[model samples]
Target: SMFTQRLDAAAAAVQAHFDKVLAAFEPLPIVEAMAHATSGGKRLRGFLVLETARLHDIAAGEAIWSATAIEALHAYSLVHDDLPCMDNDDMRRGQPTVHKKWDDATAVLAGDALQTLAFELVTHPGASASAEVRADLALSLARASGAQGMVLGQALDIAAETARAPLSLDEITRLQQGKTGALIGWSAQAGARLAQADTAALKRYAQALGLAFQIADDILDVTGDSAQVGKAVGKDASAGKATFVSLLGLDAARARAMSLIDEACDSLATYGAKADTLRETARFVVRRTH
Candidate 1:
């Protein structure tokens, strides 16, 4: 119930922000294509942003813009990930993927534009955050979403599958850290940074939860259904993708996720009552079915 309530509120906020920003653009096919790809999803990253900000007693109105920015970046990543040169998928959020709904060039440009727009939203003149905080959030997000992070991880994943190489657990963990974990880390760290939290503690908290989230995602990919997940089920295995479950087995991966969750909780111990939302979110990551 807590998860659902937070999820619903965050989704509404993100949707409103998306509509407002997207309406300013010309009604091009590419813009529509991007909007289609962004429609209907769990909005888990947005939840992370909101919950993390809430840990510092930030108002929902103050946190909504940052959450929306993160969602835009995530949506852009999904569009590019489904491109012909990448995962080559045809479905997302139970709808035709961007490339399938429109021309490949349009999909590519849509993703590129969305990525830029994420930073634009964070740096908008009327944003709730200070200029320094917005700059940090934008810089951290770009780094995590770019070549040194998610992009590089995706490249490695594609290469591993194409070559039919069996991945070691360490390699799989590193890949997930770069691709999925980095962005989640950015969500937590940026939220804390924006709230003026202690730098050292924020880094520790983000690292712990980031790894926990990815391992949980790997678990869900195997056990979650398409209807609940709102995406293609069993895609990791169907595509012969390397994941924590593929490398360490399901039971071990679950154990790893729990350990990371515990670490995340421990990192927040110093904050006491202030970290209740984040603590619950860490548990939610391991317990989530979709």
Candidate 2:
């Protein structure tokens, strides 16, 4: 009950912040598409940033900028991922994806603008009242979401299409570390960066959390429906790609996810009750269908 309330409140704050930022952009066609693409999601990444900042006694008013930044960046990723050249999906978050609602070119432009806007949002000194804070989050976000991280993972996924065999467990783990884990790790450690505190504990927590999240995603791909997951499901098997589920089997993958969550929670022992909501978030990740 506590975590539910906390998570709901955090989601609301993050969405409202994103709305405020989006409202400032000109109401052009592509900008409208950008808003449209950003209109939904559980806001998990934003919630992580805000909650971690709260843990470090960072002001929500100031941390709101970083919160919105990650959500915007994530929205850009989903838009680009749904394009014809990428995942080729027509739906997202229970609606037509940007490319389907508008067009491929419009989707491309919207995603590009959204991606650039994320950097602009964190450019202001108010993010932490220190120029270094803005620089830290911006630089880390770039590395996590760009060619070295999510992009590399996406490239690996595309390259797997014609491979002689599916990827091995170690390889898939490495790919997911880039694809989904990198940004998540950044989100979890952002507060420490803003506070200039040691990031070891949160970094440890996020590494396990990120991997568990991906294992849950792989499980969803095996067991969810489009209506349930808000997108195409069973894609990994259909594509003949190896995933946690594909390599370790469903039961083992699920067990692994739970174990990783334990490790995640364990890493936050020093934070005690202050991190309980984060623990619950880890549970929700595996149990959620979407």
Candidate 3:
């Protein structure tokens, strides 16, 4: 499929760009850990950046910077998320996690550096010809991945761990929006910001796509094999965490994800056939095995 081919190309391009950037540094443990943590994943968010940028006729040379930036930011989040204080998982993507392969200090430093690197990548002159565009991308990326967004979602999840009751549907929705959706939203909006176009359509697309992605994740947690998922599965249920599947049942959660994908595809209607890949992406989100 065209979507699969494009997604693979995007992932490869982003990883190569990331590796090129990291190669400039001395191969210290922190740099090695950063490279390891960022090595492999779906790269969906990065693909979104490239795909959306194409919609706006932005060159891949320009969009690749933002693509690598988002992937780096996402890698940082995963590094921290798997820390002893957080998920504490020993494995990620079927390999030793950063904290497991190295000491906590190394993992922490790698994550910290990766976060800063994201900002650096987005603001690089190659990312956009306009300083204002670079500024907007940096500011929005900061807002998406900072205290008010991903960190806030992590905090909420931590708080929930000790709460007397599971999170309500609306509560979980808000939490996932910040935890998982914020960066997705940023990826979708990057092209519009680069083109100085209104972000409303991509914003709408990402909102639905992100929610559907989360719901699909919850479903996978219940049904996926750890080997296939490349991580632990059923942890949510075992930990008594409130997930879409737990709250809505597997069937309903799956249905909701499909509906959200419908909405996501519809949001891309304005872009016509140019957005077919994105529409297919919405479908793939709910159907992915990992």
Candidate 4:
């Protein structure tokens, strides 16, 4: 829980930034959409950005902006994920999903707006280090959200669900790598890149941390409470969806997650004292309950 405490503080900082940004907009569908999307979560991605920035000795203000941008991108994904054509979930974060709370059209527009907003915030006049850094961050986020990342992962998930055969553990891992791991990995890498820490070791650390985060999520979905998880439990099995737990059993999946966390921590060793936050984050990924 040291990481949880740090994550909470980082979430509050990002929340404040979101509040200020929302205040600038009128009470429109976009504002309402963001409010719903942001409610009730661990703010894991924000923590990655803020903590990674701190690890690299970046300024607090710049870190906050990066965290806010990550949150915005996450919020956009949630809005789209809740659509009828997507996950079709009625609830998220223990509340009505965006499409359910508002209309489908509103949810679509809201998602689009949030996605654009994330890039705009990162590229804003005073948010990032320099124009080059801002551009790279924006491009990184776009790639993660686009067909090469989350979208492709989603497509793979849908295909697996509709396919006649059961998926292997490797297939499930590949799906999650795109669906969940991509953004988490990008958050850490973006923070480091913004701080001029573009070493190969740092990239490997981010990649491993991302995989560890998703593995933990798979474990939690099998064992966590609906109240704590903020969504329906056992839906993966109910939908006959492929997961590490479903394919490899809970024990093996948990072991895999632990292994990934160890790999992630080892990758950060090269940074020494500068990697404290990243190390804590790797531990946190495997230790989180929700």
Candidate 5:
């Protein structure tokens, strides 16, 4: 409940940031689509940025920019992902997806705008007093979201669709590490970056946490209701794609997620009581139904 409360707060705050920025743009379909894409989500990435910043004694005021940045980038990813050329989904976060609400070109521009906004947000003076940190954030985000990371994973996924074989367990792991884990890893370690602290521990923490998060997502796809998930469920199965659930079976996949949560929590030992919320987060990631 505490995590939910915090998550909601982060979502609200990030939405406010989007409002403030989009207000400056002309009332057009592109801006409208951008706003639509950014609205409503768990805001998990934003929450991680804020919580980790808090761990380093960074004020929320300073951290909000990066929090918003990650959420904006995530929104961009989702907007493009739902395109007809991509996942071709009609729904997201309980609303019509950008391409569904607007047209394909509008979705493309909106996603492009959001992606650029992420760089702007992280580089804002409010994000960090140090230029080095700001530069680091932007550069890492570019790498994480671009060909070296999420795009690479997405490419692999598209290629998989035509491959003669399903992705092996190790292959899927590598793909997901890039597609899902990269941004999550960035979000989790952002605090250390802002504080210029050693990021090794948080890096370790996020690696396990991100994999567990994806495993849980695969689990949810098989078991969760579409209405509850606010999107299509069992699409992966219907497509006969390899997922943790499809590859390992539901029960074994769940056991793997549980072990990952344990590993994630263990990685946070150095932070002690301050890391309790993060520990709770790892638990929540697996326990969530959607």
Candidate 6:
């Protein structure tokens, strides 16, 4: 109950912080699309940033900027990912996607602006962090969001779509590590970086958490309802893509996710009760119906 309370609070804080950040942008049509794209989600990445910062005793004022930055970057990814050239999704978060509501051109420009805003957010003077922290966060965020990270995963996914065969289990795992896991990993360790503290424990925790998160996505693709998932379910299966559920079978995939949750929770054992909420998050990620 307390864990859910903290998660709810984290989600609220990051959502409000992102709204404020978006409000400062010029109110062009692109900006309006950006706002719509970024409006709603579980806010899980932002919550990770805020919670990890909390673990390091960083003030919310300083950490909230990092939280908002990741969310902006995430929104940009979603907008672009839904384009006709990519996954071609028409719906996201129970609403028409940016490319659907607006034109593809507007969606592209909005995504571009949102990506730039993420960098601006981390470096903004209002964040009240040292220049050193800002530079590190921004630089690492570039790697996480660029060719070496999320983009790399996406490129592989696109290639897989054209390939003659489905990706191997190992291959898909590697792909998701970059595509989804990298940002989550960055979010979880951002607090340690901000505090100039050791990131080994959180790093280990995040690695497992990221894999578990992807496995859950794979599972949800098989078992979730479209409305609850806020998007099309069974897309992977329909596309003949091999996911964890396809490769390992549903029961085995579920078992693997549970094991990874244990791995994630064990990585936080060093933090004792202070990390209980993170432990709960591990459970929530796998158990979430959506």
How much does each candidate deviate from the true structure in C-alpha RMSD? 2.0, 1.1, 0.7, 1.5, 0.9, 1.1
TM-scores for all predictions: 0.92, 0.97, 0.99, 0.95, 0.98, 0.97
Per-residue lDDT value at 114 in model 5: 94
Query: Considering summed lDDT, which 10 consecutive residues are worst modelled in model 6?
Result: 125-134
Steric clashes per prediction: 0, 0, 0, 0, 0, 0
lDDT of each: 0.79, 0.87, 0.94, 0.81, 0.92, 0.89
Off by over 4 Å in 1: 162-164
Task: Write model 6 residue lDDT over 148-181, tens digit each, in one string.
Answer: 9999999988888878888899999999989999
Off by over 4 Å in 6: none
Instruction: Put the candidates in TM-score order, highest first.
Output: 3, 5, 6, 2, 4, 1
On lDDT, who's better, 2 or 3?
3
- Cα lDDT tens digits for candidate 1, 70-186: 888889999988888877888888788888978799888999888888888778755554788777777878888888998888887877886756888788778877888777777
Return the TM-score for candidate 1, rounded to 2 decimals.
0.92
What is the per-residue lDDT of model 3 for residues 1-290, given as tens digits with 9 covering 90 to 100?
77899999988898899889999999788999999999989999999999999999999999999999999999999999999988999989989999899989999999999999999999999999999999999999999998899998998998999899999999999999899999999999998999999999999999999999999989888999999989999789777999999899998999899999989988988899999989999999999999
Predicted structure with the largest lDDT when compared to the true one: 3
lDDT of 5 at 51: 93
TM-score-superior candidate, 1 or 4: 4
Q: Which candidate leads the pack in TM-score?
A: 3
Model 4 TM-score is 0.95
- Candidate 6's error at 163, in angstroms? 1.7
Query: Local error of candidate 6 at 52, Å?
Result: 0.5
User: Can you write out model 2's per-residue Cα lDDT over 1-290, one digit (the tens) per residue?
Assistant: 87778778877887787677778878888989988987778888888888898898899888888888888898999999899988899889999999898899999999999899889877777688898888988999999999999889888878888889888998898889888998899889988888988899999999999999999988888888888889888787777888898899999999999999899999999989988878888888878878
